[PDB]
A and B are shown apart, each in its own frame.
With several copies, the nearest count.
Chain A
């Protein structure tokens, strides 16, 4: 049993996000489990999206479950012969940016009372990352960070709003290794990215000897060097 996610990894804001799961080793016709999606935003918790099933009862032609909040903007579909799962999200925002996983729901699905009760995901997929942006590709704004402890102070280079990743920051073009550090990227409320770096140097070195960081960004074509002074 293998779940393979497929679709656009890059979608523009307010547009329609569409994703399709291709199952292998199992039939979507099977009434033993529900089929749906679970998305995991970067560095965040697991959120339930929804699931459906064509295996019905006397008063319906199937079952379909939507998450109350996402209900309005989503549409769930199952193709039984072709054994495919579909997900469509209308009016998508940068807040909907997440790693989408193809999910198989286990629970009281094969023998239920009243409505079917799916409670846990037994089989997962590898998942893919979909980033929702209202923009294209942007260069980072570079500002120097002036230091002041303990005989050796610390200084750095500030990397502001940019998109997309990655960015490489080196001190004096790889001149210093020991006592060099770089922090991971941060997602802004405006859908952009940000990060920084830090280096520890003696106070005696402060003087005509200055520090310059080398910034490199491939997508936005940005190479920027800045000198740091307190």
Chain B
């Protein structure tokens, strides 16, 4: 995993947010409940 403090999400220009440092080691446990998937356009549709 890579860490980036300065971020522009949602394609925002003009405003960049700096994530402040955190004391100690950060640990988190979450549930993975779903995905965002895309299908390739190359076809060969009847193959794979």
- Residues of A at the B interface (CB closer than 8 Å) are 57-58
Contacts and interface: CB of A to CB of B under 8 A. Distances in A.
Contacts of A58: 25, 27
A56 to B, nearest CB: 8
Interface in B6-48: 25, 27
A194 to B, nearest CB: 57
The SS class assigned to the B binding surface is loop
3 contacts: A57-B25, A58-B25, A58-B27
A55 to B, nearest CB: 10
Contacts, number: 3
A63 to B, nearest CB: 14
Nearest 3 Cβ contacts at the A-B interface: A58-B27, A58-B25, A57-B25
A113 to B, nearest CB: 15
Contacts of B25: 57-58
Contacts of A57: 25
A163 to B, nearest CB: 53
Contacts of B27: 58
Nearest to B27: A58
Nearest to A56: B25
B1 to A, nearest CB: 14
A136 to B, nearest CB: 53
A127 to B, nearest CB: 36
A64 to B, nearest CB: 19
A110 to B, nearest CB: 15
Nearest to A57: B25
Nearest to A59: B27
A52 to B, nearest CB: 19
